[PDB]
Design a binder for these strands. Structure first.
Lengths: 98, 95
DNA sequence: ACGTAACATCGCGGTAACAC
DNA sequence: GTGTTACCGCGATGTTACGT
């Protein structure tokens, strides 16, 4: 274990650069990974688009986060759709399972 | 050593008895990838660990060497080196 | 033995556009 | 406002030829 993370059945191993949902590997884009990992690296806390952009993207079209969130939730599936929660007029946040 | 035996002193590598004729840069890349199997490495990492030079804007010789590496493994074992888009390459263990 | 030269392929991902 | 899905430029890899 070098930089590996675990929330629920989601595991994000930055070492091998894989994300996996109880055996089923998630084939994500680069930013879907740098986004899903950041949100899970700070579970429970809601971030805003400007925050998420300045960190995951780096130092307009802010809706690219919404697109990346949708693509993430669609790849997660219904069983894990909930893992990325929306806060109206604020932003998004990883939510912890039971 | 999932069918692949790499020889340290002789600077060689074989896959089930069929000696892979590698150049030495391709041998170094495969060894370092197989020595840290499963881990992905960026091109900056590979360039300063496996090569001496810090080309710092150019190269593409890591990409070229992986292709030469992949060809000598053939369409059976070419999956042993995986591609991580926007990041780098990694050794892959069957199965 | 290597590392550009040079192009073909194909995926990344950001904007558009609309429903709600 | 956010969910959502096209659309498609651009750029990251593949790939081989060739100069040294």
């Amino acid at each position: 274990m070098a930089g590996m993370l675990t929330v629920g059945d989601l595991v994000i191993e930055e070492s091998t650069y894989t994300a996996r949902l109880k055996g089923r590997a998630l084939e994500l884009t680069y930013k879907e990974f740098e986004l899903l990992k950041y949100l899970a690296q700070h579970a429970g806390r809601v971030f805003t688009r400007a925050q998420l952009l300045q960190e995951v993207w780096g130092y307009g079209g802010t809706r690219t986060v919404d697109v990346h969130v949708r693509r993430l939730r669609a790849k997660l599936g219904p069983e894990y759709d909930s893992m990325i929660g929306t806060v109206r007029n604020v932003g998004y946040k990883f939510v912890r399972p039971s």
